[PDB]
Design a protein around this ligand. Structure first.
Ligand SMILES: [Zn+2]
Lengths: 70, 35, 45, 71, 60, 57, 46, 97
RNA sequence: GUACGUGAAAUUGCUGAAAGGGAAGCAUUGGAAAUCAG
RNA sequence: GCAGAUCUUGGUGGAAGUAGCAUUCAAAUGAGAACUUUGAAGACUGAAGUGGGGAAAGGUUCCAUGUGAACAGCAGUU
RNA sequence: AAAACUUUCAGCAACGGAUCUCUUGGCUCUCGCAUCGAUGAAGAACGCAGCGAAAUGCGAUACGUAAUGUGAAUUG
């Protein structure tokens, strides 16, 4: 939540085989929002986490409200 | 270490999460065991 | 649990969980007029 | 460490230097097994896993391995 | 939910649009589970998963 | 109460050691409340936490 | 090349119930438990 | 009941022969013991300042005589023992107003 | 009462009764006390 | 059909509560403070650190909150 | 020479888990049948449930899908 309201970045739990390109396509085609950066990591439990930074044209809070997890 | 294969991350996570308290409602459904 | 060691272990975890939560509410609460110990004499037909 | 996890049997018996599993003999095509090791055989033989496909075959035999759909 | 016989009475691209709709609905329901949902939504997750399976079965 | 976390945060914020960190002994309540690094800077500017000066050489 | 080229241990106290080389014992060694004294006298009489 | 008096203590006679490393801890143990006996109150609180004066010369060197102030402060009856500065610690006990 | 059917012995605490001057157990004969057939 | 096999397995004794295993003051918190926390004093490593990092190795052991069952040759609010 | 202590006997309470009864297990015998895998087996790993750790089931259609049968459950 701190990242969403500060850096306009959404944090997702993504698929293990998803790379930065596919996460960008999936986010773009699922929320109609253009990311400008994707940085990922593998959590110690064997799950992947993606930080999707949005364009200044979009508000990450608005997308978060639309998704419903806000 | 640090430079660990991803299978190890799954392997380590599953081994650790096995050490986990068995839920209360689990017992209520007759029987569930350890190990 | 058909395994005697396991059913004992789960009961002890259940007993601790129950006792801890019973006094979680007990300390939160802290009535006498309504809640009175019911006895056989009070239950006599 | 002199042994690591074996890719075939998943046990930490793969000798790094010899590049061979002490349990199943990986990467030899055949599995390591011995008749003096009766208890070792029963620890890894058929039935110790899922037998997912054999259970299907045993279940299909009674009807003659029929195919198609009911009327 | 989704009945298999009326599913089989449709065309492949119609079955694809239904599958896409159901996958969206499943994604929304799992979002509701992480944000805190009700028993009705959590029970709706399993029905949606079976409904996706039925559509995939009919397509295949 | 337990102000070990505050001491670690105060040392990190002041860029000094835990030995140079000094807390007000009569403000334990407010010091204990401050648990984030932003709150530590809040206390430091208030003077509740002071960096001990270096001594002699 | 040529120029280049048992200890008694009683099974008591800490040495009771052993299986391998005991503590503070090196080289050739023999174990005794006082039960084999009866057998030793028997073998002598043999 | 509540009263304050100034005493002097012969710390030398009370630590005579004591081990060097225990001079300061034994000194505090005697001040509290001295306070308990004189003021007849079990509870005794040593002022941190008086603790500083005892420890000023290390753990092995304790001044031969100390001028101390004892007060029967009411509880929240305990004896509060705090240091008193005099030029020469040799005087009588006095009843402090 | 889940330290959960029954619950032996070893062993332990408690109460009651009695004995006890560097062993104890036991056998025989009776006395006393208690208790049974009556 | 057990009294014994330096019997097997389990249980339990006497030995035996025996062998044994550089801090001070005030305050806060707590049911409880020789061991927690803060401040003061006194000391110990003295750049070859009881310092600060990494490799290998461990695998969550990092952090926060709660608890004080089992750990703790003592205890804890640990 | 009273008490303590020691021992004996009885009672009660502990400690322990024998006995007795039981038993979705084992063991033995007999009988019928013949069916693994490159169309990827046996085995291994990882995952999957609204709330699950083992075992069971299953494989991203993931404690299951279709189909047929039964006919109203599941159940903490
Ligand atoms: Zn192998």
């Amino acid at each position: 939540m701190k990242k969403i309201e500060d850096d306009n970045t959404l944090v997702f739990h993504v698929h293990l085989k998803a790379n930065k390109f596919t996460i960008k396509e999936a986010v773009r085609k699922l929320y109609s929002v253009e990311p400008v950066k994707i940085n990922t990591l593998i959590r110690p439990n064997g799950t992947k986490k993606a930080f999707v930074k949005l364009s200044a044209d979009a508000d990450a809070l608005d997308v978060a409200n639309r998704i419903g997890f806000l | 270490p640090s430079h660990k294969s991803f299978r190890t991350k799954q392997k380590l996570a599953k081994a650790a999460r096995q050490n986990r308290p068995i839920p209360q409602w689990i017992r209520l459904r007759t029987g569930n065991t350890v190990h | 649990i058909k395994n005697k060691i396991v059913r004992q272990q789960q009961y002890m975890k259940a007993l601790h969980q129950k006792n801890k939560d019973k006094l979680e509410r007990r300390k939160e609460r802290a009535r006498l007029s309504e809640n009175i110990p019911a006895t056989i004499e009070s239950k006599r037909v | 460490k002199s042994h690591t996890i074996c890719r075939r049997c998943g046990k930490r018996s793969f000798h790094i230097q010899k590049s061979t599993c002490a349990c199943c003999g990986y990467p030899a095509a055949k599995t390591r097994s011995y008749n003096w090791g009766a208890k070792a055989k029963r620890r890894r033989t058929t039935g110790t896993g899922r037998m997912s496909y054999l259970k299907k075959v045993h279940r299909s035999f009674k009807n003659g391995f029929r195919s198609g759909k009911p009327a | 939910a989704l009945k298999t016989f009326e599913l089989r009475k449709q065309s492949q691209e119609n079955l694809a649009e239904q599958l896409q709709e159901l996958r969206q609905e499943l994604a929304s329901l799992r979002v509701q589970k992480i944000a805190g949902g009700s028993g009705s939504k959590l029970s709706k997750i399993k029905t949606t998963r079976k409904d996706i399976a039925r559509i995939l079965t009919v397509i295949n | 109460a337990n102000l070990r976390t505050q001491k670690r945060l105060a040392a990190s914020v002041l860029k000094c050691g835990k030995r140079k960190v000094w807390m007000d002994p009569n403000e334990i309540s407010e010091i204990s409340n401050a648990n984030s690094r932003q709150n530590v800077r809040k206390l430091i500017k208030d003077g509740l936490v002071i960096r001990k000066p270096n001594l002699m050489h | 090349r040529l120029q280049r080229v048992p200890t008694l241990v009683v099974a008591k106290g800490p040495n009771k119930g052993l299986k391998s080389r005991p503590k503070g014992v090196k080289g050739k060694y023999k174990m005794v438990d006082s039960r084999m004294k009866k057998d030793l006298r028997a073998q002598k009489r043999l | 009941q509540v009263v304050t008096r100034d005493y002097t203590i012969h710390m030398h006679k009370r630590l005579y022969g004591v081990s060097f490393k225990k001079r300061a801890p034994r000194a505090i143990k005697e001040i509290v013991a001295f306070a308990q006996k004189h003021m007849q109150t079990k509870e005794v609180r040593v002022d941190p300042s008086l603790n500083k004066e005892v420890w000023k010369r290390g753990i092995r060197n304790v001044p031969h005589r100390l001028r101390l102030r004892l007060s029967r402060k009411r509880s929240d009856l305990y004896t509060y023992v705090q240091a008193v500065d005099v030029a020469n610690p040799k005087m009588e006990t006095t009843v402090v107003e």
